[PDB]
Amino acid sequence: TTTLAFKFRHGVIVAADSRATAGAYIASQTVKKVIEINPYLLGTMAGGAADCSFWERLLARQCRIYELRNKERISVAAASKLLANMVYQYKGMGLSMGTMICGWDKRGPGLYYVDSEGNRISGATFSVGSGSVYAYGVMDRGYSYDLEVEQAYDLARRAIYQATYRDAYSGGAVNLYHVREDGWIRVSSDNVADLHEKYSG
Amino acid sequence: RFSPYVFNGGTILAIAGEDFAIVASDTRLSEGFSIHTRDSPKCYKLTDKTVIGCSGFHGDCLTLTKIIEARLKMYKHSNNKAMTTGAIAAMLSTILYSRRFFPYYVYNIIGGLDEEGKGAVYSFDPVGSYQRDSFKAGGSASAMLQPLLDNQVGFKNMQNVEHVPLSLDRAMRLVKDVFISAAERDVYTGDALRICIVTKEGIREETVSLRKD
Amino acid sequence: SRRYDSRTTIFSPEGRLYQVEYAMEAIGHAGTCLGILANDGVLLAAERRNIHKLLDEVFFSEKIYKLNEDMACSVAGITSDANVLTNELRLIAQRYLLQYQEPIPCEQLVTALCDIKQAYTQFGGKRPFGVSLLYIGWDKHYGFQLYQSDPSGNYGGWKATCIGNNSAAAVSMLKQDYKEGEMTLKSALALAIKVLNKTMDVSKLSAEKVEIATLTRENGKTVIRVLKQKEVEQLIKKHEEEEAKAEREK
Amino acid sequence: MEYLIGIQGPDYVLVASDRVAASNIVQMKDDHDKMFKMSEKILLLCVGEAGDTVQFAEYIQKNVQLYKMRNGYELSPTAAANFTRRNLADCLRSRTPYHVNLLLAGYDEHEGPALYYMDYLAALAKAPFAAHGYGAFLTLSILDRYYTPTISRERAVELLRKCLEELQKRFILNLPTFSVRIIDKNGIHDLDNISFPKQ
Amino acid sequence: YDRGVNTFSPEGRLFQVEYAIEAIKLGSTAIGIQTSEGVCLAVEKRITSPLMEPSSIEKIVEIDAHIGCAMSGLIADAKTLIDKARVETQNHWFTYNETMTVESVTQAVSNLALQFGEEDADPGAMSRPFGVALLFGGVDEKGPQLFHMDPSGTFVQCDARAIGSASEGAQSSLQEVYHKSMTLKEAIKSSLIILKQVMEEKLNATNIELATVQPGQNFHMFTKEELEEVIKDI
Amino acid sequence: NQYDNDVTVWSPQGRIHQIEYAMEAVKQGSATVGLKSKTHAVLVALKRAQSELAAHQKKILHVDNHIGISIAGLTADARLLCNFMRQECLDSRFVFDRPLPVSRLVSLIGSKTQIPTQRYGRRPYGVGLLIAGYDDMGPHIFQTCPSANYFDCRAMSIGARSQSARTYLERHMSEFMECNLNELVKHGLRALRETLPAEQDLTTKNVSIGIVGKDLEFTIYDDDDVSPFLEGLEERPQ
Amino acid sequence: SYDRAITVFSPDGHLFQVEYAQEAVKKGSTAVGVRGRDIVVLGVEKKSVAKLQDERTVRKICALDDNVCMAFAGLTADARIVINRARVECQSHRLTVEDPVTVEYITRYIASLKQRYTQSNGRRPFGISALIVGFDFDGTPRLYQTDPSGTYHAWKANAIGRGAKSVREFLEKNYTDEAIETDDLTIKLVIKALLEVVQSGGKNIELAVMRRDQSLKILNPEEIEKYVAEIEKEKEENEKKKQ
Amino acid sequence: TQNPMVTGTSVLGVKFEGGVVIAADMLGSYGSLARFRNISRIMRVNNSTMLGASGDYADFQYLKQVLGQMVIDEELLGDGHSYSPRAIHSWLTRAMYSRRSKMNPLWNTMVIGGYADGESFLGYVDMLGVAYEAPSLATGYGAYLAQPLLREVLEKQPVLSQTEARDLVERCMRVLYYRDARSYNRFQIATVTEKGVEIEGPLSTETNWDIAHMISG
């Protein structure tokens, strides 16, 4: 895996690869690792595939029920806290799962990192997965809060790309989403083979 | 001590066409270095529009099969309609994850038709992680089947080739070919190949023969 | 089964709980028991119904229970229910102590018992406890304190109050001789002697018939003491020497 | 790995913690806060296991606040400390033990300033000064060398600076910035973050 | 003379259930109309004081994006049922990745019918039936659908139905104006007309609430302005 | 009056009034008919409507591929019992991979429904059932009462004014065993229509049919699918 | 346990136990509350002044959280139960959700609790009604009212308890935009409304106010006597020079 | 059962024209010890089916008790329905898998033979719940020794007569007695036909030992 997300002036950028492995064997390269919880809430996905999918889906259910009950939309902090609380009750049982809850809140752009270990921290930028370090490199070397939209897109896409270059367990296609105040938008979905041609020559 | 698992072999394949869906599997049930039976297809007809392939540990295969049957019936009694293919996929996901801490040792591939009549494959992992595919292999010889279909159906690594959609005929011969090749290298794959074709007309069953060694 | 049920936790058409009121009627027949709050302490004074020539007297008291090193209580009604509630009170106090490592604030203890009584009024189908309680104590939050709790699970903090037989007249009599902010333990004892004198059906009042305890603050520690017969006799005699004195002016 | 430090003065309690939230080999947060306001005059510095820290700390916090709402007055720092110690000790031999080391800073209207130290085994001990984490091994001795019971808050802050600088010198972990707060008769006061202009 | 909550009358009915049916008759009257262009639900709010904020009176709620519900009688009882319905729909979405048919939801809620009793029961189990009546209006694969449910648990599909105090009269007035081909505007108009007839207070934009569920649009609660624009053509 | 309100109270005449009161619930619903040939089992149910704007109440329910039922009484209890039967059938298929013999399912219904008639605070099931099934003993029509008693029938009718239908069936029992499917459904429809005044008769809007047999799984015909059965019937007398 | 149906339907379709509980509420001390622009005020009448009783230990106004306060009318013990459970819930909400609590939410919780007690075996409806008051984030001041039945609504101003209809009518005829245009004027409105039913005093009235992002503030009898003096002055400077 | 004690070895099965035949020795072994040399490891489950069992004999006795009770329970009704061999096989599969999933297996490997509705049935059931149908079956060492012989014949001649199948079985039992160190020269043969289930008494296997005098040359 190799997901990453950072918040700047114009919302929250979210990006991921799509590779899924079963050992050294590449089981898939067409995995949607950015779960669409709500039209304003996204959840990245890294680690145990079934674990992430199931728990974030359940999170989506819970957020929907919250929306119906309280006649208002759930906050990013509340969603992340919900997921964290659900996951914590299974601590030590072997759930492998590291996700990012991103969205736009009444407090503006929101981004949280939530672990199967029990972590839950808000922050500006985050990178999760086997290739997270490689992404962290370029992302940190190119990040700014005053980044223009297309620039942020380039930064995220490139970071995930370099990550796929070094990390043997990351590849497939770079997917890119943008979270704005009126909801999120599916920015891009470029295959790595094409991005190679674009970035090298 | 005591192990509640035993690998029984078996290979499984599903291809999705524009108006069809193929679900095929070998018919060899084995254990250790021995053959249990040569007449054991891994294909299970769920509905007129949906066929399931289950490989791995035979106990969990049987159990999961019967469970899926029962729950199909339940859904039918509850909503007065048959389960759509994608619905069966989601249900299967939940059922598989329900044993997250004592998994069914089963590789599952669902092949059928969606609500628009088009073909669809859904590939699963033993604990419920699934996705929709045009074509996927699973089971012992999976790594032998996948790369060819990536080349021939996905047209990958081929320069200036035409993207002609897969016809039922070509798909059929492709299935027979990959299974025949797998029978050469995989020791768990052999005896016979059962193929299940799913169209608007219904479900056909064909049976090619594989080597017995 | 449904026939034998007396429906103890059910609203009456007027919007009231009959078993609670009947329990109040039970309390009205029990020995008179009052308490007064002062500036240098707080005291309890109760009529003794266990007054017979052949009784053995093997306890420090009869209607005065020690609950906590900073708290004591007196009781009126069914004595066994009183035993249950007092034991439970001690339990609660020791739990709070075990948890926070400091004495339980008086009001918290009272509310803690009252929640149980209320619970007995709302569900379970059991009869409520026919017991009213008076609580005296000291804590670092509100100093000296007097409380009263009824079987309804309801409670309140008082500067002086009474509970038991002839409680009403005793309350008005306390209203008359009250002294907000100017009360000392001695004058409070005088008041207690007076009220208990007029309210107790058997007049003259020997020290045999009453029971008085005081809670005071002395050198950092809290002292709870039950007065001996002699001291009570002193208070009574003084009351008569103040009653035969005011009657001279005629 | 996390670092806590507490220094009690005659009428105040000075507390400080690192601002690093790290996982694996990377710092994931440079502004992490390890302190929890429980009363208007009580701070809880919790550190340790992944989810155990926040879970336990927030549980204690909300229970203290519940006490405040139920009774109209706040728990004393001592009562608080023994409450947390009771909770932590009760879960010690249970199915769900909380692996947390903690400090409790407080000011009482009666007893004055107070600092408490708690093992993950829930052993509560009052101290003029304490520290948690590996960094403690490098700082405690310093605190032994220069601490006096009558130390002024300015001198206390300077001492804290000596400690943190020592961390910058000998400790192999990064730890560039530190949260610093003080507690007195006027409650909790946030101070300027002690930081070292590395990069 | 007191008896068990699961006692039968000599006529062959449960006393408590019948009494609940009697309880419905004291509730705010509501009307639901089914139309191939969508389903509409209207209900009077019965404001008992000018000081009472009318926007805090909701007798029409959203079960899901494709299903809305109107209620009459003891509303407090209805809240539980509503939440149960929402939870059921979300569970079904989680499990099967699809929306619930209106009939399935209605049936699911209807399963909590005679789930009451004394002996041989759970500590938190219901002691009495729900004194409320429900109209489920929604759009599924079978198009627009309207269902009715009463404390007996008997649920049935209706083309047009009125529940509440003015049940009979409003039902007659409904029978007089319903043909299985009305437009949604006609349905809303008729609903508000019959409502104005049966209501004791003057029908206005803050006196009632109206909501529609149509094949192309989600559950929509009519705002003040839209309500006015329909009341306009009285 | 003192033996009326509890199911655990015998009357001095050796009767249980709550059970009988529960039996009265069956007669409160719309009538239904069940009959069997030698190859087919058929349920014909008269659906009832509140107003003309309300759809007609479901009266025929699917249990298993070889078993269906027709209800008469409290729809909630009906749904309960139905779900029970469905569950038992599913269990039988899960365990033995063969369909549950109808008679055994009926026996289980008896056992289950008997329990609450003997416990304080409990109540009998306020519903009567007609069960049509097919197994390797042929077709079967069963009847279950709130009294937890069950009957194996050649033909039966339960509910409001079902006496007429009963009287009809009792004359054509001898014909039933040899009829083809269409004639069987015919007889069922005539029996059903006997329970109506001459001012009203059967319609595609108020008649449901359930059929199971050696050549057919249990199927339910409701609206336009009922017409091939109604169209082919006498004009009836007055 | 006690598996007995207590609250059941009557042949006319009534829940007698709930109605009885409402009658128990009717016997309670009058409790009123009004909602203003930047303030919200709750006042309770006949506090049963015995003058030998500590006023603090018998207050009918309780804070549930820093955000929400609440007054009640009816059985005081039941009210203690409900209040404590409400406080616990207010904390649990913070535990499961980072955000605090909305007035509507805690009101809904209390209402649901009461209803649950109207439909559960072996239990018995709470004999209280509650006036819940708060200033949830977004600044919007809100006041709600609950009922033993489980029903709950929002109000601009309301009253419960002994002679609640009288104070309801008074408030209906007196709630304007001119009134409650200033904080002191809203408080004066509450005091007047209370005086329109209380046994003519001021030492019988307990009034408390919540304002903006501040904490709950209870009014001392001195300040209450001051506002009552201004009210008795406005009743002789605008009602004496015209009548 | 986590540690099997007294056990029985191979169990053979094979279909023939109008019936099914099953074989199993009468030995219960306590490790390498031939402890109980006279026990039946074959049960008559009603008139249409029959069961042979390998593994822990006690667990087999348990299953024997349970199955016997089920058959009695059914026979009490007399409603004209009875357990088909396939049904019994399905039940047994369900049971073994259930015990497997409780991490408390019944240490048995079983062969169910049957004849109902004119069709011959032969089913295999594991202790893990692995079950299947086949024209020939062999458990334990049989699966390595007897089964290859059985398949050789059945792929050269699918349909066998009863005498042919019986001969095949006899020869297989001979091979097993030769090569299986935990077998015994005293076995039983059970047969299902339309006439019912018949278990033939203590049989012995003729043995050739001429290759004993081939040491030198």
Ligand SMILES: CC(C)C[C@H](NC(=O)[C@H](CCc1ccccc1)NC(=O)CN1CCOCC1)C(=O)N[C@@H](Cc1ccccc1)C(=O)N[C@@H](CC(C)C)[C@@H](O)[C@H](C)CO
């Ligand atoms: C079949 C594929 C498509 C999915 C794959 N599943 C699997 O690998 C399943 C999981 C079975 C299981 C049992 C018990 C408890 C948990 C899981 N295992 C198997 O299918 C069979 N194998 C047996 C021998 O070989 C290895 C696995 C998977 O989840 N892969 C993870 C890595 C992993 C995590 C935890 C356990 C096992 C594997 C993955 O791709 N993660 C990516 C993100 C997600 C959303 C796909 C990333 O982490 C990136 C790609 C790096 O791997």
